[model samples]
Target: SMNPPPPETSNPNKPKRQTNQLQYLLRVVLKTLWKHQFAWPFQQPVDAVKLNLPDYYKIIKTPMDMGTIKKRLENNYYWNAQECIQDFNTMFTNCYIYNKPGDDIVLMAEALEKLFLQKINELPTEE
Candidate 1:
């Protein structure tokens, strides 16, 4: 093994973290913005753990359209499945970074906006 995996953490069951219903909902919104993998869209693969509920709350204000998403899902089930999974990964990463003390969370928002633009441009050519 050229690059061996790191050892597991000391405790596997160290009191699981919690997230509010709203936070979960917001995360879903931010993630679905992309129609599918810098981050691959699939099923519910990633777990929404250890997220900052407050930061998640702020993200909900963006408000994505479920109907449009539904259409995409209807049209391309497999592709959309991959898209959904990636969405969760992206959202989880965003929330995780924002909650760090002294970290520049604002940068997450800027990158999200810029990346979103690029993602949109790529949708037309997606396989």
Candidate 2:
């Protein structure tokens, strides 16, 4: 009789950060935006971290490596300032519905708008 391989076991110690499709997608967007901006020379880590969730210490601490940004863009997955603006607008709309206006949300909205304008100006336009 062929002996069956040892039973597979899962590691219970592993951190379980289970996120649904929507949650995962949202996180992806947020992370990408942060990473992209942080990667920019004009965007400093100290200033960038202040615009959003104060409780999100991990995001502030994690430096967005150039390799990861390049990899993500190569894979056709990346965030731009326009997308960030749209995402933040949608977020604000939701917050408005719940009457949960937050200063951080407003901060992000203004920051993205300014960043988007700056990004637009940086692009080469045909004369």
- Put down candidate 2 lDDT per residue, 1-127, tens digits, no spaces: 2222221122345333322322333344434455654334322222324444343333323333223333333333423433323433443343333233466544554565455445444433322
For model 1, state the Cα shift of residue 86 in Å: 7.3
- The TM-scores, one per candidate, come to 0.25, 0.26
Pairs with steric clashes in candidate 1: 36-83, 41-82, 41-83, 42-81, 42-82
Q: Give candidates' CA RMSD values in order.
A: 15.5, 15.9
lDDT of 2 at 13: 50
For candidate 1, the 10 contiguous residues with the lowest summed lDDT are: 1-10
Scored against the true structure, residue 40 in model 2 reaches a CA lDDT of 47
Q: Report clashes for each candidate as comma-separated counts.
A: 5, 0
Model 2 whole-model lDDT (C-alpha atoms): 0.37
Which run of 10 residues does model 2 get worst, by summed lDDT?
1-10
